[PDB]
Amino acid sequence: KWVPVTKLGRLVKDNKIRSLEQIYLHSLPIKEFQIIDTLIGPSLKDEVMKIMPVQKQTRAGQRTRFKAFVVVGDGNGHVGLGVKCSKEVATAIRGAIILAKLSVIPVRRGYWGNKIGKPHTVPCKVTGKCGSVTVRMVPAPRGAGIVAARVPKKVLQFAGIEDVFTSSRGSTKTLGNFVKATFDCLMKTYGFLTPDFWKETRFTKSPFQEYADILSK
RNA sequence: UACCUGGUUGAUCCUGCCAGUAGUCAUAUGCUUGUCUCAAAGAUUAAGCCAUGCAUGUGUAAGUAUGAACAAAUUCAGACUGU
Ligand SMILES: [K+]
Numbered sequence A: 001k002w003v004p005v006t007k008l009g010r011l012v013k014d015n016k017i018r019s020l021e022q023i024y025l026h027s028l029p030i031k032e033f034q035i036i037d038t039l040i041g042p043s044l045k046d047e048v049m050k051i052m053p054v055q056k057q058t059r060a061g062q063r064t065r066f067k068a069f070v071v072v073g074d075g076n077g078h079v080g081l082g083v084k085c086s087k088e089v090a091t092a093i094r095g096a097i098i099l100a101k102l103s104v105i106p107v108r109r110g111y112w113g114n115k116i117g118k119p120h121t122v123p124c125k126v127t128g129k130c131g132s133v134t135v136r137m138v139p140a141p142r143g144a145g146i147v148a149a150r151v152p153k154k155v156l157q158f159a160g161i162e163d164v165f166t167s168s169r170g171s172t173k174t175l176g177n178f179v180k181a182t183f184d185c186l187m188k189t190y191g192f193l194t195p196d197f198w199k200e201t202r203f204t205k206s207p208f209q210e211y212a213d214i215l216s217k
Numbered sequence B: 001u002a003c004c005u006g007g008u009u010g011a012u013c014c015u016g017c018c019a020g021u022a023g024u025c026a027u028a029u030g031c032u033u034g035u036c037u038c039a040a041a042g043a044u045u046a047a048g049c050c051a052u053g054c055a056u057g058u059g060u061a062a063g064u065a066u067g068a069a070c071a072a073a074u075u076c077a078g079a080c081u082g083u
């Protein structure tokens, strides 16, 4: 079946780690997609966003390969992006799905004004940049919906954000850079220091230290 | 009610525009057009030129009646006193 090759994979298969937030807290790299499948696999959905052909010139013509862009998300604060290039479309799509699973990140959602109910928009103004494409997200009031193009709109929908205002500059017709800028903007949500985070951090044992004895075998 | 997509390349990321998409109590034209309620309409070019018809008249007890105007009365007198 699955034979983990990493300490994190062993812990996830042994049920020692039960939530993706435990891994996110210590910023540990995730190198096996079975970890994500076990943790949040049931609620994850995938979608192929674009199949892009690329060509390399050779002495005997053009060698064509296909680029697959895949977005995964649970619609509840987790989203991932995957890009893979392969000779066959199916292989590229499979690799892109694996990479999108491996890159899932937590998305912070906040309130525009009054803080009643679940969060509905981005906590603050965030901006992402890939290549020349820059994507800006602005908090929006409840009921405003997702005001974004179809690619950013899909990325935001997979992240579970209910309403947001967006603006884009640059070559947004470069779909890869557009989606990557949106992904970077979403990732930057948890890096902004707000007054609610001013409390002193109270550290907890890392999984590799907490379960060192188990991993010692 | 804070949104983009096609097009320069063997392929790439750009600048940049062309094209698309939507709107006008916005004009015109094409095809089509069964019912109800609303409703613009010779401004744009020529404040260019105009046949014909109409679009400014007017009376109360209370300015001026002798129509040779109509009506009712008067057998005798009457300035006039109805229209
Ligand atoms: K009019």
Ligand SMILES: [Mg+2]
Pocket: none
């Ligand atoms: Mg604008």
Ligand SMILES: [Mg+2]
Pocket: none
């Ligand atoms: Mg070509």
